[model samples]
Target: NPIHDRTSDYHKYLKVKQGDSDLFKLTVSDKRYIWYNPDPDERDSYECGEIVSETSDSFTFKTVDGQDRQVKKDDANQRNPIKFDGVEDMSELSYLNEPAVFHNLRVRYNQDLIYTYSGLFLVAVNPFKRIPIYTQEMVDIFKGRRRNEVAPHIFAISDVAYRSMLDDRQNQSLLITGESGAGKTENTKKVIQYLASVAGRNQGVLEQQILQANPILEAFGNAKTTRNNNSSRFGKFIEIQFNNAGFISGASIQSYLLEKSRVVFQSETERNYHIFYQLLAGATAEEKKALHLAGPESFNYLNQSGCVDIKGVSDEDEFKITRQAMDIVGFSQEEQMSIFKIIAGILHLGNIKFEKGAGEGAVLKDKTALNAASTVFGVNPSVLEKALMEPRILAGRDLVAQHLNVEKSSSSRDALVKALYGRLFLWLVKKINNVLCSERAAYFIGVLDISGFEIFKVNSFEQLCINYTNEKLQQFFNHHMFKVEQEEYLKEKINLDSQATIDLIDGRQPPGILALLDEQSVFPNATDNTLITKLHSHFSKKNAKYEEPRFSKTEFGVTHYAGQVMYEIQDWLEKNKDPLQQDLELCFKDSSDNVVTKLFNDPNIASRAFITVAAQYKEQLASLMATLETTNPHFVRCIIPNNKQLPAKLEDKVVLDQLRCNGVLEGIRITRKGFPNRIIYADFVKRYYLLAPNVPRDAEDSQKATDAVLKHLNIDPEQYRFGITKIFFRAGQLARIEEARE
Candidate 1:
């Protein structure tokens, strides 16, 4: 019923009581609504109020405290009228400013109606609790309906995309991006859910498999961070492949940048991948003994954070779901066990500690974890220890063994674990792909669920890569919008230009930040400091987008679209290199377990040349953008209502920041810059001809009919544009036409 009804109780007036004198004062002011900071300390905070009096340059407003406050006209934030509050689409609002947009979304968010249509995309604010709108009944309501016909739900977007894919016979994509707790993952699931339901029509085993793929991926790819209970530490693009008839056919998931550091170490109050805990708790006693596994507290990786259990989460219970998902996805019993073996081996490898020896080189007094890891990994225990402590490196033409100090040795151990975990993750994705990809497909819908622009207390290489991904994504959206607008304008005989922060981060001609980092990665004498020096040499005062922090030499800042984020260059070189000793690779290559051997020897996995993380991400993102360029993209900007992750509370500052950072504001700006609303001439005439009786319903020329209707309605020429096949209306103009028709 809520979806059927466009109107809501968004007209709750200001809390302040107005006396007769105040009413007269407001009547004289002409502008009745205004935005005031309820709390000045919170700069982004604002509350709706009613204007009481106005002069030539200043206005007085009544606040909730029942007190009158005076402010200059220039400082006052104008609010939209009651008619615009809670409108399903924001472009319908007459005033499109930051406070107006924020207040509209904030009002709807408070009503438990979290989805609102911005100009070109849907803004989904996290409700922080389960809303019943995602059920099958809900999906059925949105079926076959146009975007405007249904309420702003993710299902509507998905259906629109699915229909567009079928109608246009072109590939489609849903670019869902936001912060950690902003529900990107949840929205992704819903998109996949709606597609599977509509396309599969509840009959294909592949649908169930596609749905089941989520739990398995989440178990391995998601982890507990300070911000989210099930935060995804990787970037994933899932393609749901369809056949000629539009029925569900097959699917494939491409994942990037699984946080390898989480495997070796977890920060305070955080946990590693859910698979580690799931394996530890769900393994049979016989299997556990064989794997030499113990409680989570016994392993450094699992216990380092000191917080093992998530409230309301049962690791034991989740393990069943994971194993069942894997089974549903067609993993053989042996394959499942082998996957678990690698997981257990990684856990044991984390527990392998190095102590300072008498000499400069390190010594391992305890081989307990050593034996445990080698046993499960099916490798020689002594060889594994030797590989960890003393690996052979090639100096010029000679290959000689070198002993590492305690710090280097332990780091080597961690690097080996990181490599193994990363490889296992890639292997899992490949296995999933093998089962899901089909030989034939008409076209596919790619759903990109990746991290949004992030700025934390400490930004590192991971943050740089994540933010870089978001930068490129943002640029893609900008380019897409420009292209869409330019194409439509071309139809109307108008013309636009291109270019940004992205070039500063990824440019190659002058070798920008990422390129410089890659260059330093390959330099034999490069250290983190030297990397910083190189960056300073290239970008300090030379590039406007790059900044060298005034007081901190080890930190460099990039002026991202979101904000300036300072990155610590402590381990940039090492993390970029991501070296795994060859001895460790050879030890695993000869393992008795076929899976382990394949992971170490597979040419695709092993024979690849040294590629830095930045370069790898750049290449992968290039391909992703290339694939996306071939599709019609639907953007979904997920918003976190509150940083505290509680229900019924929306932080204005947090919400507003994301609105600015995630391009929601930019989206509206661009949409309003030109015609924001457009309809094909035929459709426009078919819908509006009743208001213009002079225009025949069955007019031969749709463009003439559109022209006649506009002329009949006395539309201002500046408010609309006549394109080759369509009519474009400025923001809120078509809404006025619709109102007139009503």
Candidate 2:
């Protein structure tokens, strides 16, 4: 009667049997025949119950009220739960301290809990569906609670940062990183929401104004993508300025690299930014006539994706919110209309068809589309049409005007579309800053809501840009977490093998990836082939990350701190030299709508504005890093639950890959092994002398005092290491001393 089937090759020879029971998972459309009548109409609702037993055809479960019921697990959405090894934090898992347990913990918690601690990182998973948390009551409870005393949460992260900032009188930074749909944008908003709700009792209009700016920016900057319906397509660092008493006084935003390409082109499954669709669906009849929009299906740009709606979302309602936000941000009616007209101009510019000409250039099919764009933009239609045909360019100081063939003409049109949207987005940011800027606030807390490393089936120039940015941020993370602590040890003459850990990603060296990229961008004749050739000839033999990948001759791969990604060099050269045409620049001279001139005005083109996108991005990133280095930092890493964008379905491999990509597990390992916490010898002796046996507070013998304290407290010396005049401890190593003394 040993029917448990433990024989050799039993699992290998296993086959499915008829009428096998699976698991219990509820769905909205589930239907069955039963007699559990409880509703007003006496309906048989399949209820949730804990498992009692399993059989061939059904699961025998015990209801909460202590009754048995059989629910057939036959094709009723049997999505199952992932198991954790009973540890709230993945760091506590004994020898299974790998990404397997880390991902399992993330998936399980994000299913219903949505937060878990992995040493330095508070790993967050987007619950595509909301969980019953983040209330005022929740904020109050987490306000002063210790991280270990509470469930892992964004509130806990925020609380710790808040406490440190106030207690130490230091600036704070909460860095949130993830891909578009992984919830970094939402988490950034949550930081704002929590800070506003708890910072004080009488929050002023300044705080509320910062709150209102979010939706206005989202409508213009976020969009529908393959993985996320409301994906943020831009990067923003929102800094809420605080007063001496720790109250919100003013706020300003510094945004980076809006996805200008989406204004003209979108794939089959994705849609343009929310404002275009929102305008088409929401504008009044007269307003529509002014902008030449009927609905999302009417405009060539809006109809390209063939997606008219996002489920359960009203673009019309969102447009109203955008308008309201404009007023809150101190934009007048004329200024608001200026933004609308520019957006409408871009949509109309998309519809302008070019007719193939015999010799000169591509000619306009009709004047109607050009006139509409000109009217909205307040420019001359004839000038606009000619600009599309043969635009003047600078071949040096001499002007070189030339005709555009169909292909060149199409690219020129797309370039104009990008210029319009990108400039308008920048204009909006500046206006909001002008409205909110103040000298009243004393210090600030910055929340960096930027996407993490991205991967796609067909990687492009856009992917290259985002991935490079991720490389820089990864370098910053390494420098902050490991290098700073290690350097502290070096300052005290400790011989640790951690001196060059920071240089792994900070590639300013001759053969470093970023340095190679920067050098390639400086060459006027450089192509992708040349860049790859340089990389192969130099860094390929030197660095593990830099290489000529086996896949394509034109495509080389770099093993970023995230992971190895192969990028195609095709079309990358033109993208790097994002030029503003002087040919088209002449048409806007007479228009001068302020918004119109800002994108074209010659000074912006001739002077410092013509810097390559790569160089510009480096400058902005350097500034952000310099600012972050001045703050007390916190990190929250967001993970997408599933690639399918569905709730309650998590793929462990996909989640684990993302963890590996971002270095969460690697970071955990480093934190667990390194001497991360330290104090100056003078400071250590002054504070812990009371805890050390026979050591006075004024003792000059810092080294012996530290020894006396550690032995008197009976701590494992393995947990710490002594330098010349300082002592170093790994996680929780010195907290015991602090607690004992307290």
Candidate 3:
């Protein structure tokens, strides 16, 4: 084997082949670039080849130069060779192997290369800056090609999926998952951009509208975080509809979990949604005066996070884009002003702080703040203040007046802002879809741009809510790839048989983590200690996944599929409930602006919250899954290249932590170590009658029958996971068989 050649001559021969050589005068098509020389500025040559086959140690491929070249995949890309471990390093292992894929990724990141391939996964590590790869010429390169035919690119995946939908007439869903700054949203946009660009000779008005909606969505739903300047605070799933004729016909967007609380409370370094600041920066002096907005500092809500301007972003320019995008969605000038008015009202309301009245109880510290809010919301100041301090509640058989203490009144104020902003966000989504929706959408390519797994030092109710949804997403990945991949295998006469203590969060019964959170939310005096004590009693010792951490009585931990995440449990009870009090709900009951009243009017305002955030999240998550289960699923496991946001720096521990947690490492291993993609005896024969004339329905020799087909395809026997009744192939193994049949 070429891998076993250890002589000095052999080393020289391999070196010649990897770079310039008359022997391996390689083909034009296989010459994709790579960063092999440790110095990135150094021109590292291309190791170009077609992936012809696989082996236990490495991948084997042929170059266009009429020469076959076999290299260790990810040498750093590869862990190390069997005989070569301490002896010396082969010029940088090309690791086609398991540890090699991740190892190579580490080195590649160090080398400023952010994409790599493992099985069906195309991993993207954020560059923290734009690259030249997104050009039109780049998109053209991926057209009508198999993933292996081109350099690994998300466009390659997009074209393949788009083509599959055209040929199979089946809907496809591309799920893009990663943390805040990890480029899921941008990647999703790229897919839409490519699809919109290539669908026809010209753009569909609907397709153009789909792309235009992003700027508006970003303004209202994105914010600044410590990690990313333009981070998305909500998850957006876009459905780009294609007609039977393959035209880009219609499109719609479903938004998930807008971090409404951010509108009221931001972390010390995090800013609220970008719209607040944009409105101020973009406002003319007259408009600012009309809205009672001098600047961000004038509003308590906009200033609390202490991050009014992003390091590199100009909110003023962003506001122009927002207006331009709204014009695309056909929003009228009046409608635009109405939306800004509500945002301005939210700002002024935050400044309406409460203090004790002489004898009557709670009162606004500044009556002007209340009048400004009342003017913006189109509600009378007395009425708004009346509801803020003393509101009617239905208790037992009689009407009782609920009195607000300073804290209670303050909370109510924040809740109203959250509710208003939350509903405003929801309305924008609905309105955009109404304009963009088409009746002829028969099939769609749905791209799910959701938040990824997160674990921070303080991990609050918001973090848990975000993380729990990801837990379910991880469950979907596992279920779809392993358990459900085989469901297709068993539909014929032949049959086949698939997180952690994942039950802690989604555990259906009482005392289970999520249930416990929901349960304690109803307690009159429920404290974090009470919740922690209950967790200790129910799961601390016995359940390995759940436990209280050492040295801290107020914190608890869960060993999730990703990793162990410690959660500080104080101040979560009220947040878990996420209640916007009914009394506050009353202030909007009879507002002058129909839009303001409509937000709180019906007690149920068009999927508006009469319930807690946990309940809404669970319901919406179920809805999203329902949409997913109806279609074929594709995945993109995105990664942040470096937390430092530099050009060529990679922290090994940081990248590896993500690899392990993102399930990229685990997913590749599943295929590597076991049967994940496979076809049974009869089905294999039915699908590929050309492989063998008499193949099956005939198998005391079933193993031999299927083994022969794979062998004929030249796949290594080691890569095949065979069974008495069926045969299993690694990811690309099945594809090769299908390609041969084609």
Candidate 4:
């Protein structure tokens, strides 16, 4: 009777019957009535008192009038209280609110309560017990074990909402959302790490490659923010598809909102992530000389006040790693060099100097700078002059722009140089994407290391453009549809894709505003030569109070300051190539092999074209290495409190009390539901002691105490062999000596 009572009490206190009543009673023949009111308002209603014949969504229930009525579980307002029903008023009994709270009233039985969340269901092995699990130990366990199959003694959880989407059938998406420093990106990396280790048991190559993708991504995507020491600004969706054998079949990456402008420049107080610094600091002396570029401190953008100086993270190391990753992704040497050449050319361009002429003019004064530029562009200074100053064939348009217009001063030249460098940066990013997402990358993951969402006080046109791009991408995710219209063009079985089409879908085309800016081509009479000019004109026309244009040229225009040509429209356009266009081309090329080759000639365009490109790839590699070192089922708990001060230490007894109050066991308990005839602990210890004769032996010291205890228990000291510690002890002898003295 006591056993039966204990079982009933256990069932009542455990709340297992109430939480999972349907599953537990599935095999029972007896139909018992249990009143359930999921909502408090319905607690007094007749509908709440009705007992269902089955636990199905729809069940038949007989009313007091002897009439059967159909009822559903969803209709329940609230469920009856499990145990100690009226004890809710006690603050100490708050453990009932905890999801894992469950009681086992039976003293003989061990297991109690269950924890289920995030699609993972875990049963408590021991009730009213406490087991210490260290964080570092968890990380080690995760790293040591390969992932491919389900691991033993590991408890995993997923949200119930995504349970239907995740099961054995279709691929499920697990979205990790949080504030910048809340470890969302890190957690996502861990998920992939855990999945790769367990799910890639047989495919070592795939596992390594997959794990490597993170470092490359982090280098580019993550950055330092006021909120987080390392924060991933971009949103990344990594889809891991599995084959029939349960091994990884393929993995794809979908990225949203890359802050491309940051590639060129970053705000004061914030460094441009790692790549900018890495490139300037890491390149070899020969490489720097070849590129005609100075160190990071030489550049105004890099040497800004309050920039971060990361330790042990040299740009040269990054360069080496980036080169290796490119090779692994199948980039040719020529392709890599070509990209580098662009970057080198840009740096040389930055050094070009202009001087005021004797009268009404500006002239190139630095012939040495001209010579350096000549080498980078692979053209003579005279040839460059002819191309810039005279008409030349460009996309079938007669491009006639005044260059070295002494009237446009040295400052304009510097601006043009900066703009070109910026374009070169974007182009390089595109090139890298092309290589990694190439046909040769058949089953590999593409790690995207682009910047994330940013908002500032003085947001410019460039900022508006990047933020707008992110908004469009976010819409795609929310609606499950890409805005771009993708149409495959075929000619003799050679299918070609259009980047313009993709840009249209992604809302990156800039048609509405950019087209108006480019209207200078058609509206020559309007006296506005560039889109920016037209924008200024349109604003001026709408608002009569608007100030006159600050820029020099009105149309095909040049601003005149102090009798000298200040800024030129044509030069600005050439130097400041639209990064959105470049990125779109990259995405389009990545989507199709044939298009990639046609659109991008250099496979390593991503790496060489921009200084930041190589840096991002290197960062991703570092992130991967760190993740590998840390390994396992990980927990990143943000210990934020109502009060800011953190305690130096917490008492173990206090922690145990809290656990016990939360329905956990006070001490360890082992209940074997199923057992194998494994080796006994006593036998193992005896064998271990027999092999180690010099180990310490004292009751107070851990090693000695263990040895002394084992010896007293009659274990052979010589049989013990310490795998980690080589020191040995005469285990039985120490115990006999101690006992004789006693």
Candidate 5:
């Protein structure tokens, strides 16, 4: 019987079963005969046997004591030696032999060790077993090369389902999803980077073009928040659809759930992500002054601890990069400039100020505001002001008007500003999508940087809108994966129905949750007048629906309501309003229309229109069925193992627990798992000074601590060999140990 010895804590025979050695007649129980490399020099020092057969690029080895051992130069069994104390050791370490023992020793011909699917060799990292398929050499081999070449850091996972779609000339989407700060965006970037680098026929121009697209997307889509250092508040799907030639054919980006409200406002403790801060910081002094805006530090919402200074990055730099990206994607200079002007206009709007004018109520205090507005609209200030103050006939002969009233004071100005800002943001999004979509490039990858799921005290209408938008996007994914169309495709192995595919496209109805949310426009008795009045009344009520929304809770909150009602407000107001306000003189005289118009006109309200629309649709009695379908989405949760030093006798229980929960969920295939996913962990040992000199020291005490930690983690000592630490025992090593005893 091969029983492991506990004294030396090294299982020699176990290593042999892992293909570590060859030709030992009898199993040795003595620890003295165990190999130890105190000053092991060459890579061969870690090899336990001598060469039995040799070739230029390949060889076989057997134990020096004449045990049958075999080895090959590039054989699958080659083990990447683990370094002990910065030196490779031949002696069996406590945890070093565990992989062989649990995986190879217990199981015979393990199928889990090898994965042969879709003609690809994917090495799965099994927590319960040791299948040493990927070594450092493998990672290094694939590191810098493009897709066709073998590079360490990048590779492709071929799926039969995806290949069938590709063969049939159908569009394929690489859906990457995870919780905030789970490195979903970064991994998505890598996938695109790999695909672009390898897939492009013209490496020089195509690579740069694809790479440059990120900064542009980052500027528009990403922001800073508490949960994720860099979170994506939007969902983006980049279609790398190809033609028959296998060359680049066409690419398009469909975006979902952009947290536009951050453009206008953020919380006191939280700073809006880098784009907002960077744009303001990078603006030229002349531009800043032109907008009547102070720096980011001057803003109450931005003056926080994590706020970054825009010293190295500039708005001009971003503009230049965006222009280059546009050029690469074949955008005309006029289109590029048009987009830039929109961004500049938004910056300008940020600078505008509304001041209470003593008896005048509210007034635009800055002349620059009107000037910037004029510049963006490409009209004289007088003309712009005229259009804003009065309704005009549109091309359809339909009356398009601002809510203006001479008696209501600030009402018209507020509405006009709101409409201008809202249209500007929509125009910006359209411009970006248009430039990216028009080129029909072979493949395009989009990087989204937006906020995470957030709920807070005093959560208002906007928060509800953003959260609800996310809910819809999640539903869209579910529809793609499990709907009747997907089920039929999977069952018959046939192309997805055309209508099903069409529904998945952005701006389409039924499948387009955003479009469905917009149905609030058709709500009976719902209009801008009714919606705003209802909102004002909702707030004015003694008890609001939600007083303080919890930040961490994932369930119900303010974010839900923000979207549901805003979508319906316009329609509600349109139908329920009194006919008395329709008269020209009465409209000009009554403050009610003015107040209602301001609600719709607020730029902040417009930026988050998608969310508000979704939320409102959800609240309606008729739209509840659609709401249910859009809220629940399929997800892939990932849990990465921690590979850092913990304080002696003190375990990282919090992180360990998180890993276990995430791993169990992943193991059940509840969520997809991927390697090299980035994880940002707070350094608790460093944070708490647990490893300082003030800690306690006892030989048995350390053992007890380790045992307790293992018990809490429900793992064996050998299970986490990669995580253990070894220290040289010294006489004074225990000094200042009292503080750590606790």
Candidate 6:
């Protein structure tokens, strides 16, 4: 029995209730029970116990270990009834507390039920392994089913969004959010898969192309980080477009903030983008010779992390799939060759090292790497070397070739590589969009799969931008809920938070963090220290959300919706400025290769004004939010089961933190604060007409019939509110009525 049913919820919860019999002896206790160590640091660390005795102020509880402990009645979290345990939707629980929510998630997670509903969003816990629930068989079961009728699933949510778009004639968006390694990307793929199956074109060609987009995007944009095997280094929102007839027509991808820094340098255990490894491992000998490519170890960019390969991943096989995807996505054979040429060229550029010359200027003695890069990129080797080491810049009026030191020259080369790679990525998105865009399309279900809120030990400019985007997104989610309540409150006819946090980061009137950072970016004399001091002068003690860390001069903290994230200002100015020489751009603009030439000469790419990275991200996020605002949004919070990415091991503390950070708990609280459940009066009467025998089953006056039903059942006035067209129930109010009817 232990071997077969050890993981059962009954067996587990019963073990935590061993001391219950001892409480009956000391009782007046028909229903007195409490959760001991309820606020434990870890989720499972708590114990279930019974209240042995009570005072007006305090209660003594017998814990599972037979330890007698006293806790204030107000401080204790009440245990939920056994009937409410492991409910599919968490809002149905009478006791909506942390331990209750955590226990429910864990109970379901143990059973491999990774999806659950908490108020407005669906929480999908990462199983960290293949869970066969995403198959075609599973998708069929969830089709045309209401949320309550089926078990929680990504497919269910996708079906609902698809149905909602058709029924309401409104655009839909599934905003998938989580930290890296939390299954955001995987869930995003599942959502698309479900949508394509349900609404794909008859020929299946568009669906194949739509599905193939992931492989191409991941090859160029994803990499292996310490936290995840296949981590997407960029944020993307893919809009799967559909015709008015509810069939898939086309799709477009809009990407944001490619981590171009990873190209030149990776940390201790990271790798460069997957395309570098795939090309090195899978390119043919003839193709390799043409590009002058070698193994990953030979390249400076690929070898920096000391991790050439990821365990259990076949870059060679992935390379084939990437090529196939390129073909499916309509990339011509010549275009594919040109794309790889730029990829190979970036690797060669990384190998172009510099040293001090006889004069103050730097000299690149290694022309072997230089010639290979120029050959692949179709740029002159002599011009490439000169542009890297001593690019000409206009000083006031006249153009002069400024000599750089070894360090400056090397950084300049890195800047060029980052620019080339970043531009190449944008061009890929443009080409994919061109192929996927349909003028005949009517509506769309956009899937936003961006990096979640981050709070690292040493946060940087990248973290700031990502966190800022999350802060705005969180505000959007909160405002969305607020608007939902506003309609109800309007019918009855109330007010929202985080506006300060948004202002502290993005406000322009008084100049917020990004605003001030952009202001400091244009000043040529501005240093990172100067930027930090300027931020402090504007925000320290003046803004509620901004905190200048007392211990460190270089660090500043922002109170994001998730938590406080302290960001280090080490290279804020240099990174935001993202300076690349005009000579490098001029050199690459004339490349013979189609991809490399377009990367530079493309007028669409050149038309954008030169701005700080943070400013650009802010503008992009602003546009993203504006787009999301026009659609009916569905939120999906992906929870990582554990820090270590292993299946069947749910870490309590890690999951608890995510639950709190992702606003699952707060969402429940807000719902409880207002009417969490609402149904049309006609539907309400139709379901509960049996409870009121006097009322007609098919009552024309539904509001009158609903009032009669509630009156007959003696439903508490405090627990229900009658809106104009709907009957609203506070949390658990409808549950009680449903149970009564059953």
lDDT of all predictions: 0.83, 0.71, 0.70, 0.38, 0.37, 0.83
Q: Candidate 2, 188: how far from true, in Å?
A: 0.7
Error of 4 at 25 (Å): 29
Estimated TM-score for each candidate: 0.88, 0.75, 0.77, 0.44, 0.47, 0.88
lDDT of 6 by residue, 1-742 (tens): 4212445332342222233353212322255567767545654567777878889989889887777989897677666655455677887676666777888888888777788888678998988877676677667767898887666778888899999999998999999998889999998999999999988866478899889999999999999999998999999998989998999999899998899999999999889899999999999999999989899889889898899899999999999999999999999999999998989889998888787857878997767999999999998888888898879988879899998888888898999898888988889889988988787779999999987788888899898888888878887888887787676677753223578888888888988888888888778888988989988998899887889887899998888888888999999888888888999988888888878888788777653467677877788888999999999999999999888899999887788788888788788877766676667789877667877768866878998999998998998998887878777777657755655542
Please report how far candidate 5 places residue 252 from its true position, in Å: 0.8
lDDT rank order: 1, 6, 2, 3, 4, 5
List model 5 lDDT by residue over 297-395, tens digit each. 654345554455442445556655655665776557665444444444445544445455354334445667567744653445554444434445343
**lDDT score of residue 443 within candidate 2:** 83
Per-residue lDDT of candidate 4, residues 11-122 (tens digit): 3433233343422123323332333333437422223234556565866565555566666644422222223222111111212212112221111122222221110112
Candidate 2 ranges with C-alpha deviation above 4 Å? 1-86, 103-111, 200-203, 395-400, 483-527, 534-538, 602-610, 671-742
Off by over 4 Å in 6: 1-32, 38-44, 56-58, 486-496, 674-742
**Over all chains combined, what TM-score does candidate 5 have?**
0.47
Ranking, TM-score, top scorer first: 6, 1, 3, 2, 5, 4
Evaluated at residue 592, the lDDT of candidate 2 is 52
How many clashes does each candidate structure show, in the order listed? 0, 3, 16, 81, 46, 2
* lDDT at position 713, candidate 5: 36
Q: Which one wins by TM-score: 3 or 5?
A: 3
Best by TM-score: 6
Q: Is candidate 1 or candidate 5 better by lDDT?
A: 1
Q: Per-residue lDDT for 470-517 in model 1, tens only?
A: 877788888887787677688777431113577777889978888989
